[PDB]
């Protein structure tokens, strides 16, 4: 039930900030985005040891662009997902963890 | 018709060399790759330069990874195309 996922990211308004990685499953791609926030949160000095989903949302809003292309086993093609869908999936994953 | 196309490129074996751009149509994305080959050919000799079809292909094999994701209006999804498909289309556009 794992589907190849391409994660597209543009970190800054600059076009040369467009980078990408691919993952074995959508869950892996969502986990990678959470790890990115945790790395970013680590750099903050003097902060609470707990973080809320709202902060994860704020980190994703800092990205100029974030989207996913998820392989659909039925069609053989990739379904595109944008930031709002990604936020919801991250919320569901965190609430279940 | 015009179909949203994402061009994925990895220039070196390093994973952090993975970059991408998107275009309004497959033709634009294919044209960009040809622009890239011509730019690369310029710096090698710094002279007027002619190239063979094999050299055109070789530039695409020199990239660690190149692929395209082409939006299909009928399916509403993106078709993945890999290097072999791109090489064929780049040649046809060149011809």
């Amino acid at each position: 039930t794992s589907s190849h996922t391409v994660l597209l990211i543009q970190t800054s308004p600059r076009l040369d900030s467009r980078t990408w990685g691919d993952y074995e499953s959508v869950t892996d791609a969502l986990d990678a985005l959470c790890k990115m926030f945790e790395d970013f949160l680590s750099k903050k000095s003097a902060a609470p040891v707990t973080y809320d989903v709202s902060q994860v949302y704020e980190f994703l809003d800092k990205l100029s662009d974030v989207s996913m292309m998820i392989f659909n086993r039925e069609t053989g093609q990739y379904i595109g997902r944008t930031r709002a869908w990604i936020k919801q999936q991250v919320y569901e994953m965190m609430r279940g963890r | 018709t015009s179909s949203h196309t994402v061009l994925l490129i990895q220039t070196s074996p390093r994973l952090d060399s993975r970059t991408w751009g998107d275009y309004e149509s497959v033709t634009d994305a294919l044209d960009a790759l040809c622009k890239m080959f011509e730019d690369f050919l310029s710096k090698k000799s710094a002279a007027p330069v002619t190239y063979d079809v094999s050299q055109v292909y070789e530039f695409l094999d020199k990239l660690s990874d190149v692929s395209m994701m082409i939006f299909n209006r009928e399916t509403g999804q993106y078709i993945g195309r890999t290097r072999a498909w791109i090489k064929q289309q780049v040649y046809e556009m060149m011809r």
Partner: peptide, 17 residues
């Protein structure tokens, strides 16, 4: 923080070995 800090965090996780 700035955009480079954002890029560093993205690159660290996305392009890890």
């Amino acid at each position: 923080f700035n955009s480079e800090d954002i890029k560093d965090s993205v690159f660290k996780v996305l392009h890890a070995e």
